[PDB]
């Protein structure tokens, strides 16, 4: 047998490499540069025609299997990591591309949350997945994902990128280099997603709960006269060479707060753990609480894990969660690989198990015969 | 719970309804378009029409297989992973728990009430699911009224009108003197 | 290819998936009679090589070395192949002036041998987890095998004989409080030079560092030498074992090297009417062809069609002479002079014939597109023949129709 | 334009000798060391300096206007000297292009206003796109396209370059005639 390849198709970035390795070999933006198109189209797009999606995935998988990885597709197996409740037609297409065009031996559709649990070694743990599109949580108890007690909110990368763009356009101060030393607002109508992502990573950080709670009430201005903490210094960011955008200190520590803002509904990234944990079985409560896992690149943002764990323990004392989750000890697990590449590492650890892989995985001979991929929906 | 599970399957079709306001239109989608198949396995293998539903904003959504495999979780709650008996089971178990002499008459007089019986082909499925669990060659009549949603109130409206109701209710002065039990003891 | 706009006039492929591609990109399948696209054909892996120091590495060595060259390095700041400079060696880039001294890597006495990448921090924990799950997976295999052979036997679990060292990993300890964000981040100027961008962060995925001083230079990525193999046909084309510093094909096969290539020599007016002159060069030494067909009526995907090209011309026998010929060396009677065709045929040079197509532009608003079918006598040589030993009359008789789609500038 | 190469009428003033045509406008300071064996074209306002050079060009070589081919200086501890470059057979240098390259391979299409760095080797059957910067001491493999300010692998070329490029350079030469 040969070392099975692991792919993990995401909206922002795709993880790729081989099984039984310390981390992924290639990690790249999930896009393709088609002739005529100035900006490259995104390879994973939900709610489009199958033929157009088929062509994009055919183009992308080709780049992964030749330019990034150097190996024959037909020779060795595949371990496709994809999140639970991934759209039906997308997963059906992705398999149909691998089985028909590339003619792979067998694909294994592992849920990202159960794979993240294997990397630690613990059999039972709560898993939060703060991705690009949606920040999803799914309790895993001793190998069994509990779909009953699922939770998701659109407070990921996309929702954060959009919030940054909005704030920058309000307090817009750019030095074009054409008598634009004076503050010039909205010279460009929209900012490209590639720039916004680079600003987010380098400039913006996650504030402490004490400082963050003041920032929330400050921008609200709820019958108070200038009750904001002192912001960090303003950082100057180059746009397309000559144009120098002066990023305000307030924007850096306020952009993140949309994730941890209550917004009346009581629906934050913090609340989603406690909302799910309260809905879980009464016996499983204390085991899941003690074993928390924080995957996804959105949680890589500096000082996110401290704010989350703090915001949890504050929301615990709130009267809604005070009865059930009152006297619970919330402890976070530190996975071996980085927060972005926890999902991938599980699939590699699973891919190394040649004996179990072949049995669980769906063979091409079965797919060609039936034409029915197994899912958590009815058969 | 059927509205909650439909939201999950709608995300599996690729339409998110994250907001608490957006949960209300999932309840509207359920109430508008969700039919209970007599055989669930045959309808899954059959290619769906993907019937379009129109949202408040004006946008269209193709529901497809989520339409029929959402309200199925009433009759089979183990599928999602909820430890319960099921709607067909609780009806039969309630009759079987009662004395042997009454079982035949209780099967012969079943009444559907509430809004979560108005699902298209609910009576058709329940009749079939009850028959296989119930004893052979027993007459099973599931007598649904036309006003199932408003049946519970109409009953109270009739009960209230009767002169016997005058005796049944607890007066304000009675509650002050008797104590807390007054409401509980007069209930039945 | 690019200078002349090959991405204009396209040839169609037959099969499940229909594709419009330039003849330059397409390949002709000789085993059968059907040209197929780079998309349609299946791809293989032959050889790996470094783009800087062109060294053909074997497949086994690549797996050990993780598809990388040991000697060559790529800079982390910008993506370019580094160069060894002395004073006793330091690694430096030409485009950006990033040095190995900047991040604080010590200079090596030996040139290539000294340089290395640090070991992965969670490599020991990795192997322990694999071996735990490997032992645990092996138990499930034995359980699944024992269960399966019991079902195959169909003895209803008949007890003939008596039924029925452990590896235990310790699960990772959960920290009570994770390390808070350092108070430096509050009230400190952020230099965008010091912190690293996402692109250069993600190129080092094993321990993607925020600071630049931590970010080490990764080994240069090895490139691939593609070999094409079809569904119906077996072989198609391939490359030598010394693809480094070589432009030779072990088996040369391409649509331009069999099917007669069409090119628009002259472009007329685009104002509702014109007469366009197109050339039809042959590639084969001796053959015959014809551009008679008008692509039928609503058949063979003529949806792109936005004009009515007549091309009402009978077959014209053209031949290629693989030799350095002079300007009008000799005038052949039967090939050239006999079919004079002054209205139809524009000019007839060596391996060249100009043809006037009567297009009908401005049927839509703009972007004029013409569909026409081209026929050719394909000397397939499918049957066993050594230097054309067999007559190959039935092969030559075979008329292959390629649905061409020419797109005028507009 | 649509596969077919277009007409370009040259003026009377041009040095036509043994097939090799060289525009009189274009200075080539150092005529001794530079050598043009084949039927080469050098367009007006182009530079081929003899700064200790040995500039050998192809059979059907083409250099469009405002374009420079200068040899690079090798920073050697023994002796600092200008390395003699060798332009390959059937080489097409595009307009306004800068070339400080040592050993340019045969059957290559160098793009418009693209700066090739010092001591840069190019292997045969490659293509550099327009507005691109190849840094000093870089190599580009066959059947490749290098682009961007970094100057890195963008993709692969068509398989038939060796056969195709011949038609391009020879057609341009044949089509390029006096008025
Ligand atoms: N190392 C990092 N540091 C900070 N932010 C990151 C990092 N890596 C990714 N991100 C951000 O977090 C997101 C993570 O998305 P990812 O989990 O890769 O995608 P998906 O959820 O589709 O699998 C990215 O879109 C990016 O904005
Ligand atoms: N026409 C309908 N079709 C399907 N489901 C319906 C329909 N009308 C109501 N429902 C469901 O039943 C619910 C109404 O329950 P209801 O009968 O009011 O309960 P109760 O008896 O406690 O008052 C709605 O919220 C909806 O989920
Ligand atoms: Zn074939
Ligand atoms: Zn190398
Ligand atoms: Zn660099």
Author numbering:
A (entry chain J): 12 to 390
B (entry chain I): 189 to 376
C (entry chain Y): 2 to 88, 106 to 182, 219 to 464
D (entry chain V): 1 to 179
From the article:
Dynactin is built around an Arp1/actin filament, which is capped by pointed and barbed‐end complexes (Schafer et al, 1994; Eckley et al, 1999; Imai et al, 2014; Chowdhury et al, 2015; Urnavicius et al, 2015). Dynein binds dynactin in the presence of coiled‐coil cargo adaptors, such as BICD2, BICDR1, and Hook3 to form a highly processive motor complex (McKenney et al, 2014; Schlager et al, 2014a). The pointed end is important for binding dynein‐dynactin cargo adaptors (Zhang et al, 2011; Yeh et al, 2012; Urnavicius et al, 2015; Gama et al, 2017; Qiu et al, 2018; Urnavicius et al, 2018).
We performed signal subtraction on the TDR and TDH datasets individually to focus on the pointed end, which slightly improved the density around the cargo adaptor interaction sites compared with previous maps (Urnavicius et al, 2018). In our previous TDH structure, we noticed two coiled coils at the pointed end (Urnavicius et al, 2018). The main one appears to only contact site 3, whereas the second coiled coil binds to site 2, using a different subset of residues compared to BICDR1. It also makes a small contact with a loop in the p62 β‐sandwich. For both adaptors we saw a large reduction in binding to the site 1 and site 4 mutants, with more minor reductions when site 2 and site 3 were altered. The importance of site 4 for Hook3 binding was also not expected. Our structures did not show strong density for Hook3 interacting with this part of the pointed end (Urnavicius et al, 2018). However, reexamination of our new TDH map at low threshold reveals a weak tube of density contacting site 4 that appears to connect to the main coiled coil of Hook3 via a flexible linker. Although we cannot establish the location of the Hook3 Spindly box in our maps, the observation that Hook3 also depends on site 4 raises the possibility that this site is the major contact point for the Spindly box motif.
